[PDB]
């Protein structure tokens, strides 16, 4: 019925697994700033929402490969979460 929660679960899984694997892939490259889990979790949100401020980004092969998975899986899931919120909002747009 409300599979929007299932897409929300998949989004949180991508945000958590992405931030965990990013720190795992970035530690080892001199100059890398995506090397601590707390700020790496907000980087996953920056990538999945496509906002991308640029304060945090990968600079390694794997780290950028992890970002690709966060892009493909996160933007799709976040697009499904924000689409359900759009449908619900219209459902009251006529109950004026």
């Amino acid at each position, epitope marked *: 019925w409300r599979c929007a929660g299932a897409a929300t679960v998949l989004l949180v899984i991508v945000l958590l697994a992405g931030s*965990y694997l990013a*720190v*795992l892939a*970035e*530690r*080892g*490259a*001199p*100059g*890398a*700033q995506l*090397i*601590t*889990y*707390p700020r790496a979790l907000f980087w996953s949100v920056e990538t999945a929402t496509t906002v991308g401020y640029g304060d945090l980004y990968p600079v390694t092969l794997w780290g950028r490969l992890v970002a690709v998975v966060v892009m493909v899986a996160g933007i799709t899931s976040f697009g499904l979460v924000t689409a359900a919120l759009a449908t619900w909002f219209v459902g009251q747009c006529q109950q004026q």
Partner: antibody
Amino acid sequence: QVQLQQPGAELVKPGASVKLSCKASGYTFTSDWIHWVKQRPGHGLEWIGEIIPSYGRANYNEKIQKKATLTADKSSSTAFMQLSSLTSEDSAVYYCARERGDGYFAVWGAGTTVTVSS
Amino acid sequence: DILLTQSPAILSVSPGERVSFSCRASQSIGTDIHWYQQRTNGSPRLLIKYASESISGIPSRFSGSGSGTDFTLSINSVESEDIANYYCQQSNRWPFTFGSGTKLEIKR
């Protein structure tokens, strides 16, 4: 309680290789990193390398010589640093510290005084 | 790699006076600096995390400040137990680096 336990001292022959241990107690998280810090007598703190026991992933200080190999045993919760081909310059105190993946070292070990002499 | 300079290396001070340790970074690290204390024949002990945030179990006279490249660890009023070495350590870029260390001395 003593969260990180290290052997007291290790005597190494010139050219031999020692294996140090660091048994962890307390909360064990999948995001925990174990670090190793070398302190030569009269000098300061010198970062050797790090290892995450969850994945088996390990890193080392490129700034100095890499004489170490970091390993872990998730069953017994003990990290292992294997120093090979030791010289007189390697005689120092070797600490182990636990990092929650957030930048700082919350708890340290007592250190292991490694002496290289015949 | 980020170079942490602690100047000066020895800080002599009369008891009861305010003391400040200095740690300069080779490039801006924001607020990802951490302070440690090491007494004779002892292991390092965390004093302040993230420039200013205090740790559970540290006297209130220990405080921290700074951002960018210049950071400071202050002791409001020094007593004999504060005689040790003090190190700064950054966590902004890989790898983690320590400072050169500063020794505190008291003019009793």
